[PDB]
Design a protein around this ligand. Structure first.
Ligand SMILES: Nc1ncnc2c1ncn2[C@@H]1O[C@H](COP(=O)(O)OP(=O)(O)OP(=O)(O)O)[C@@H](O)[C@H]1O
Ligand SMILES: Nc1ncnc2c1ncn2[C@@H]1O[C@H](COP(=O)(O)OP(=O)(O)OP(=O)(O)O)[C@@H](O)[C@H]1O
Ligand SMILES: Nc1ncnc2c1ncn2[C@@H]1O[C@H](COP(=O)(O)OP(=O)(O)OP(=O)(O)O)[C@@H](O)[C@H]1O
Ligand SMILES: [Mg+2]
Ligand SMILES: [Mg+2]
Ligand SMILES: [Mg+2]
Lengths: 434, 114, 383, 478, 380, 52, 104
């Protein structure tokens, strides 16, 4: 219907002599070694759209026929996506046949309107003691995860998947935004060998959809993969009525890819180097992760801080949406404590006596006080001696040392390689024991 | 190939169309034949609104804009170089460049008229 | 390529017409052959030339005013920003994906206005006055311009009346006059919203015992926030009964940056009803530092040259012309007032930032909320 | 040529098909111009004055000439504007001659080595940062330091030397005042008339209200006036006060002629803006007369940040550097000369031989004093041989002080450095070494200053006889 | 007056004269007889300058296709625009003029891969520059291939021994990972790379044929003295039996320095895709990003941070994701990448440095204060 | 015809308030470019502007 | 980088003859991270880096003894007696560079 006018890298101009496709509509290119999907970014005038490509544009000719699909990128959605790897345009990557779609849904969608919003602000209980006591997760919130390598972040992700799918009966989506393919394959294998993803005829019993956009994909492809994972979660929220988890892995790479897309489209960059639409491209994503009257989506988004600078506009704009932060640190991890959640560094907007109650609030604030006044006599432990202390401060040391032991917990998904079985912990048990 | 020299060097993108229109009308010896039918089209844009809609409207199709032009220039004072010009000026929406290309055609003419 | 040497080409100079009446009898059958391929020509309506980035360039619209609310045929509304010699630049109050090249743009005939009146009290509107609470359209209301100029020197008087905010630290140490503007500046998560909410709940508590002319009608402008936060806030105001006196203008984080930019002006237009009729208003522009970011996005998508931090340079005027409308009027103008509480979020306590120091130069005082006092449990964390 | 468009002091002019690049044009409203952007359709003309008297379609007549100024001896004492024309209200420039403002600088065969000194009269300068005739020396510093004060004292001191030397070795000064107030330069002509230094001083002044092509052209106009003395065997001295303001006026013309911006907004050609001008300060060979031109460009930094764009251009053009600091200015050290950063690439080969031998140890003793005062800032320890370094170095920094409008000749300087580098001002309290050296100049008889000036060097017939009289002096305290 | 709307013309193309010149000079009856410039598989040079040629015509050229000028100098069609083609030149543009004919070759950019590449010092396009004849036992392959996906990979278990004790002890490297060698100027990045290559030669004499590692050294932006010295080192050590060297030097054109890491990666992927093991070292990947920034700024692409394009992360990531450990059903082959990023003053928060730190698995950070402390290899 | 001088004031007729335009530039095609002393909301692209 | 390379790659030894080239490089604000010196650094066989602090200590030539590098400082080129003396001199100077932070 249309034809390619320009190819400037990942940016293609298509000329429609008929009627132009809408903005954010998906275009398919007729005749190309891989299926090339273009997403319409703007109308340039003189019957030309400017599009961003979801794959490589090498071998694209001026005048190639381009078919408008009349809608945005529609992805297979439903329970038949569980345990599958799906890319940004919906194709199966896991090489296990087509995806059994209950429906196809456009990945572009406005946020739930003001009357569909819920006003309740309650706990999503996770079964992990440290992130249900000291930093509770809001049901329908966004959670920063300041982890890294070797702090047990992957085991924490699949434990959150397993615990929410077991207790709350809601599935999970992993949005691999800008992932290393080595790490994405490692996550896929660790989800296979821990039972949160099953294969073959047991595919339907799996608990998580993987939506992957690699690093070697063009910036339009990995700028939209979080929207694909959000559509897969939004079906479970809207149509199934569940409490879904979303794992936007490295929300900073979402920001980076939208910055690159805005730069390739010719836009003048704002502060430090970012897109002028940084807050708006972030709020377009983060406002669809809410609680509706049907169900909720909760996000555990990994957060990267660029120059170890929390005032950089990408983490400063991201932290305006986060309702909780879960800091995984190495110092807690090489102390043997798993999960390696830093109990003092982890924060929650939910930790407030008007939403969790005065009992949970005072127990958590007391545990924080005990751990904090233990962790600021450490520079008098070493220079004076452990038995130099008063008789009351040794009581606080003996209480905090057995508190920070009690924050550790064996995970149900970790029992295929640790031997010890995993213990789900309820909220009342956590508050009463602590 | 070859082309005759222009009398005076002049400006760009509308005054180099006029240089080339003078440079092919000097070879076909119809130098003052192209000039009056350039003045006719300026009169044609004056009293026809549907002919200047093919020069100013951005929403006319580029195929419709070039098919009206060839379907009114059929072998009547055609001159073959103000007829192949107007397809090439309706192929790119440059029919609005006519009031600019004839002014540069005139100043190339009296430099030929000495 | 002169101009007097081009006006001389208006008069006929051909004297030979073998092509005028050759094509004058062949033009109309050619136009009639290609007739269904023509879009109908447009002079007083408009047609979209190119749309992108939330800016539509519109051909036509021969008699639009500058700053006029235009309407696309999709229903989504715009604002005629720059009128040019050939097109009109329109900023789109909404998502620009429903706008296509070739769409008819209809002129509404009025500069950008919102419904103001008594019937907008209780209601949650969007950034353009359209209600989002689901309980119908705005009845008992009238439309008024969002960009009215602030009252001058002779239309003002000094603040005398004390506008209690209900916060002990504020009403003891930083007392707020009735037509004042007071900045609530602090870091993230330091109780900036909570001071303004306590002011609104206290105005509900005080309105039940004042003789009908000392009542203060609040407006909350929630710019750039999450929609769940605005939903919880409207739930809180209805739980405490404060919504009977407050309006909730909200242009959230997912809304378009023209809507987040314009939402303080629509909120101030709604509150200027209470200022201009002898009553008293209170307005909270919650995170005016997000309105500045939405306006920076609008300016950089219009390719306007950036200045400090990336901001356009009329980002001072953006906040100055908004906050100057919070006045205490004279006795011959009714004696009404409008108190403003702009909220500015700083990064790591840096109050020497650009937008922060811009609004410190506009407002009459500041309420600093330190994160060190907040983390130590001293709440409200008033520096 | 007809004016196509006019605005912001740029007129775009259709026509003028034979106009030269850099040629003066004339508008029919009487205002002048210069053709800078020769393009194929228009000419970009910068306007020497107010562009509000120019409309569309005005006539522009080319004058056929490149921009020139009246040079010669009739410019001395006259306060001229940004290109030649006098503004002091004293009539037209008599006894003067036109010459182009953009002249190619003299080449390698036209030069000879800088050997003869130019005495500033500022003894912080003449001891540590010596300046020869034919050298460009940058006076760089922060906002209100002693930058024009060093420049003022060098002009006042030339009047003090021109009355005592023969006709050949007299220095005729030019002060180019770019982008200042008219009030500021009216205080300087008042100062140069009061001292009498206006007899040898041209005063080119493109002030702040002047058009941007008058401030960008005024150093070239002033250098063409100063080059009359260089090209006729005499000696010039040009001071370009704020070349940093000459680059801001050049950036204005470039950005309004639509030339694309570079670093901070400046054109690419801004190094060539100042290197074209500062290479015209030369010391010519005896085949060309032996004339010289000594430049003193002045550059203002912002927070002492000498790593700015225009500041690092001129530091790499000029031979020396006189860095003045604000934290030295408020510690009482006036002139606020940073001894560590101030270089003179002509070295000691172009200074007074009487101070070549007494100030070589002065720049060596002050190098030690800077190091022992950084450590004693903590308050750790003193060693009574480290403290003697901290004792004498504090004598020399009080010795290098000078007050505002009184330059010292050359020989009462080196006697005052002889009194300080030989221990003769030890047992004098550090608070009044400023007050001690009025006594050393007053009580020592003026017969020894004539022997020191005429020899140029402390002979042992003078060196023993100097210190013989440097004990017969009443220092305060004692 | 009603013709003031025709007073100001406005054009959708700067090259409007090139269409009326193709429609008016065959409209004179003398040159109508077979005088028309062809446009489909040919092109005329509109502008040249700074290694970029704007070409009118080439209506059937593909994005990223090789073209050939009249002079034999090759080019790559990189900006396909609505009326002209933006061609980056693979040599010096002194031999390209306005009006030159640009023939399309019909092929996207190719390099010879195969076992005949081992031992040969090649250009950034596969042309042998050691003066030892043409490449014989090779096969043409595309330069920018798609990286292998998730299911085409397996985990990284087998170690790649560097021979450096700090590297093999503290920051171990497996067959299939990408490890960044990052540090200041003259801190020993190339020395760690060459120690890895020489140790692969020492290991290949002692392991079976399928455990062997074939090295590829991509010298981007280095001088020919350095590259010739390094080939002399590899021939006097004997490491050139297993090493290919791709060498786009400083005098070479910016598209050659941009395409040389992709050429070396296509040569090194021959070993990965046929069950063997590879070790590729992209020396001075910062110089590759500088050359790509040059080509992109000269093609008037919209600059981003420091001047770089939007897709410079896409450049380095689609390069470095081709170093994989393939699954057992694709041979079990491996490619190990050592990108080398030079930082200035240790600033690892620079643009290309943060990009390659994001892309790669680990990093080998070499410090200069440790380098002059005597600690060499100066691994922080 | 008869363009005003730069810095001349122009009055806009038909505005709600007194709009005064001070001429800044001569744009080149019988167009002056002006700065407005009041707000330009309501200005239509045909409005009569009277030179003073 | 390509203009500088097209210059610098001509200044070489060939099998015909040799050019021994000494090129002064100006670092703009004592800044070796500026792109013109940072682009020249890869073209040279020996970089004599002169530093401001050594000139202000009175030491001339103000060569930075640590920051100056050569490709000739290998033990198999200049011998081991030259190489071990040079490496020991640089080691002692870097030790004093670390100790000057705690002496002052
Ligand atoms: N006076 C107070 N006493 C106790 N807690 C308070 C008080 N004020 C605020 N808080 C708590 O502090 C938290 C942050 O409050 P608030 O939302 O008012 O700050 P904010 O500045 O709006 O933060 P943000 O701008 O990031 O939303 C809230 O959860 C609230 O429970
Ligand atoms: N040697 C000195 N002793 C005492 N006071 C001085 C001396 N030099 C300068 N001052 C005083 O310092 C002030 C600044 O001097 P000067 O006029 O040289 O500043 P400047 O560097 O030209 O600053 P600006 O560029 O802002 O005019 C003057 O008011 C002057 O009185
Ligand atoms: N292990 C080592 N022991 C001793 N010297 C070494 C060692 N490794 C490197 N060097 C020396 O370090 C210097 C620089 O090394 P090399 O060129 O490998 O690093 P580089 O960072 O690649 O430098 P450049 O960036 O200039 O190419 C060389 O002179 C070399 O002799
Ligand atoms: Mg808030
Ligand atoms: Mg001064
Ligand atoms: Mg190296």
């Amino acid at each position: 219907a249309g034809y390619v006018s320009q190819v400037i890298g990942p940016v293609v101009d298509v000329r429609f002599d008929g009627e132009l496709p809408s903005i954010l509509s998906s275009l398919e290119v007729e005749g190309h070694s891989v299926r090339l999907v273009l997403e319409v970014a703007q109308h340039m005038g003189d019957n030309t759209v400017r599009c961003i490509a979801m794959d490589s544009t090498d071998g694209l000719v001026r005048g190639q026929k381009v078919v408008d699909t009349g809608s945005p990128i529609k992805v297979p959605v439903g329970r038949g996506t569980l345990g599958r790897i799906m890319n940004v345009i919906g194709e199966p990557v896991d090489e296990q046949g087509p995806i059994d779609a209950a429906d196809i849904w456009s990945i572009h969608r406005e946020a739930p309107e003001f009357t569909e919003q819920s006003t309740e602000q309650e706990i999503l209980v996770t079964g992990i003691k440290v992130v249900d006591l000291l930093a509770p997760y809001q049901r329908g919130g966004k959670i920063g995860l300041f982890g890294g390598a070797g702090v047990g972040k992957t085991v924490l992700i699949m434990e959150l998947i397993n615990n929410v799918a077991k207790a709350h009966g809601g599935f999970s989506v992993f949005a691999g935004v800008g992932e290393r393919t080595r790490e994405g394959n490692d996550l896929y294998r660790e989800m296979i060998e821990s039972g949160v993803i099953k294969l073959g005829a047991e595919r339907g019993n799996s608990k998580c959809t993987l939506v992957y956009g690699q690093m070697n994909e063009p910036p339009g492809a990995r700028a939209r993969v979080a929207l694909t994972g959000l559509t897969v979660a939004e079906y479970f929220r809207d149509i199934e009525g569940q409490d879904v988890l979303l794992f936007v892995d490295n929300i900073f790479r979402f920001t980076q890819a939208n910055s690159e897309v805005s730069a390739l489209l010719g836009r003048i960059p704002s502060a430090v180097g970012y897109q002028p639409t940084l807050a708006t491209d972030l709020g377009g994503l983060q406002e669809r992760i809410t609680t509706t009257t049907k169900g909720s989506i909760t996000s555990v988004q990994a957060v990267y801080v660029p120059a170890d600078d929390l005032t950089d506009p990408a983490p400063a704009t991201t932290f305006a949406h986060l309702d909780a932060t879960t800091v995984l640190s190495r110092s807690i991890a090489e102390l043997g404590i798993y999960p390696a959640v830093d109990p003092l560094d982890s924060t929650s907007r939910m930790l407030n006596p008007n939403v969790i109650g005065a009992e949970h609030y005072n127990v958590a604030r007391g545990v924080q006080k005990v751990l904090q006044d233990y962790k600021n006599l450490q520079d008098i432990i070493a220079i004076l001696g452990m038995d130099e202390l008063s008789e009351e401060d040794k009581l606080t040391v003996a209480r905090a040392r057995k508190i920070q032991r009690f924050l550790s917990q064996p995970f149900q998904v970790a029992e295929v390689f640790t031997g010890t079985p995993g213990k789900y912990v309820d909220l009342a048990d956590t508050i009463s024991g602590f | 190939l070859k082309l005759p020299t222009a009398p005076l060097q002049l400006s760009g993108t509308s005054a180099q169309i006029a240089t080339l229109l003078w440079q092919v009308a000097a070879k076909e010896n119809q130098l003052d034949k192209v000039q009056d039918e350039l003045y006719q089209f300026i009169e044609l844009f004056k009293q026809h609104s549907e002919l200047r809609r093919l020069a100013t409207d951005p929403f006319v199709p580029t195929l419709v804009r070039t098919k009206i032009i060839s379907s009114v220039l059929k072998d009547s004072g055609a001159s073959e170089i103000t007829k192949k010009l107007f397809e090439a000026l309706a192929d790119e929406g440059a029919l609005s460049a006519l009031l600019e290309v004839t002014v540069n055609y005139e100043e190339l003419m009296l430099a030929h008229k000495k | 390529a002169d101009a007097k040497a081009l006006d001389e080409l208006r008069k006929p100079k051909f004297s030979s017409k073998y092509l005028i009446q050759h094509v004058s009898q062949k033009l109309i059958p050619a136009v009639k052959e290609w007739e269904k391929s023509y879009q109908p020509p447009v002079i007083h309506l408009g047609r979209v030339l190119s749309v992108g980035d939330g800016i539509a360039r519109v051909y036509g619209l021969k008699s639009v005013q500058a700053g006029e609310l235009v309407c696309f045929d999709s229903g989504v509304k715009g604002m005629a920003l720059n009128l040019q010699a050939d097109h009109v630049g329109v900023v789109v109050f909404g998502n620009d994906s429903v706008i296509h090249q070739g769409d008819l743009v209809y002129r509404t005939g009025q500069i950008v206005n919102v419904p103001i009146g008594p019937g907008t009290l209780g209601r949650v509107t969007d950034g353009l006055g359209q209600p989002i609470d689901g309980k119908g359209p705005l009845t008992n209301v009238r439309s008024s311009l969002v960009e009215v100029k602030a009252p001058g020197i002779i239309a003002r008087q000094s603040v005398r009346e004390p506008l209690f905010t209900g916060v002990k630290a504020v009403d003891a140490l930083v007392p707020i006059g009735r037509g004042q503007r007071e900045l609530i500046i602090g870091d993230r998560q330091t109780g900036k919203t909570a001071v303004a909410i306590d002011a609104i709940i206290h105005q509900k508590n005080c309105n039940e015992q004042v003789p009908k002319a000392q009542r203060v009608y609040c407006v909350y402008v929630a710019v750039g926030q999450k929609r769940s936060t605005v939903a919880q806030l409207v739930k809180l105001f209805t739980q405490t009964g404060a919504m009977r006196y407050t309006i909730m203008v909200s242009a959230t984080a997912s809304d378009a940056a023209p809507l987040q930019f314009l939402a303080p002006y629509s909120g101030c237009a709604m509150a200027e009803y209470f200022r201009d009729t002898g009553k008293h208003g209170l307005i909270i522009y919650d995170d005016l530092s997000k309105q500045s970011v939405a306006y920076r996005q609008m300016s950089l998508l219009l390719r306007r040259p950036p200045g400090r931090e990336a901001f356009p340079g009329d980002v001072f005027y953006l906040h100055s012309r908004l906050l100057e409308r919070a006045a205490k009027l004279s006795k011959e103008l009714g004696g009404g007032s409008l108190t403003a509480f702009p909220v500015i979020e700083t990064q790591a306590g840096d109050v020497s930032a650009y937008i922060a120091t811009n609004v410190i130069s506009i407002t009459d005082g500041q309420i600093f909320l330190e994160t060190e006092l907040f983390y130590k449990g001293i709440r409200p964390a008033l520096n | 040529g007809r004016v196509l468009s006019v605005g912001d002091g740029i007129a775009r002019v259709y026509g003028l098909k034979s106009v030269q690049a850099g040629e003066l044009v004339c508008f029919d409203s009487g205002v002048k111009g210069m053709a800078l952007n020769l393009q194929a359709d228009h000419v970009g003309v910068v306007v020497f004055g107010n562009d509000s008297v120019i409309h569309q379609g005005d006539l522009v007549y080319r004058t056929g000439q490149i921009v020139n100024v009246p040079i010669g001896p009739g410019t001395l004492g006259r306060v001229t504007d940004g290109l030649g024309q006098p503004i002091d209200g004293k009539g037209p420039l008599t006894n003067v001659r036109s010459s182009l403002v953009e002249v190619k600088a003299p080449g390698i065969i036209a030069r000879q080595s800088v050997r003869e000194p130019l005495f500033t009269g500022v003894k912080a300068v003449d001891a540590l940062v010596p300046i020869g005739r034919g050298q460009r020396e940058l006076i760089i510093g922060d906002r209100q330091t002693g930058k024009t004060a060093v420049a003022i004292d060098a002009i006042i001191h030339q009047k003090n030397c021109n009355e005592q030397v023969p006709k050949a070795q007299r220095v005729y000064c030019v002060y180019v005042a770019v982008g200042q107030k008219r009030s500021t330069v009216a205080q300087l002509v008042k100062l140069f008339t009061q001292t009498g230094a206006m007899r040898y001083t041209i005063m080119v002044s493109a002030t702040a209200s002047d058009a941007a092509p008058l401030q960008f052209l005024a150093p070239y106009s002033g250098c063409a006036m100063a080059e009359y003395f260089r090209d006729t065997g005499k000696h010039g001295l040009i001071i370009y006060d704020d070349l940093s303001k000459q680059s801001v006026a050049y950036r204005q013309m470039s950005l309004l002629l639509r030339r694309p911006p570079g670093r901070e907004a400046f054109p690419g050609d801004v190094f060539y803006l100042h290197s074209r001008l500062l290479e015209r300060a030369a010391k010519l060979s005896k085949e060309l007369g032996g004339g010289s031109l000594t430049a003193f460009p002045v550059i203002e930094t912002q927070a002492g940040d000498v790593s700015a764009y225009i500041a690092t251009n001129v530091i790499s053009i000029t031979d020396g550097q006189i860095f003045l600091e604000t934290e030295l200015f408020y510690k009482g050290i006036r002139p606020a000369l940073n001894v560590g950063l101030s270089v003179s690439r002509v070295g000691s080969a172009a200074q007074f031989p009487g101070m070549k031998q007494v100030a070589g140890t002065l720049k060596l003793e002050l190098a030690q004093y800077r190091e022992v005062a950084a450590f004693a800032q903590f308050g750790s320890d003193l060693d009574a041989a480290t403290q003697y370094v901290l004792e004498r170095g504090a004598r020399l920094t009080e010795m290098l002080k000078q007050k505002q409008f009184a330059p010292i000749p050359i020989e009462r300087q080196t006697v005052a450095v002889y009194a300080a580098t030989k221990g003769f001002l030890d047992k004098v309290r550090v608070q009044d070494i400023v007050a001690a050296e009025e006594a050393v100049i007053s009580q020592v008889n003026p017969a020894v200053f004539k022997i020191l000036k005429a020899n140029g060097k402390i002979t042992p017939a003078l060196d023993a006889h100097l210190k013989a009289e440097l004990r017969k002096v009443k220092l305060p305290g004692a």
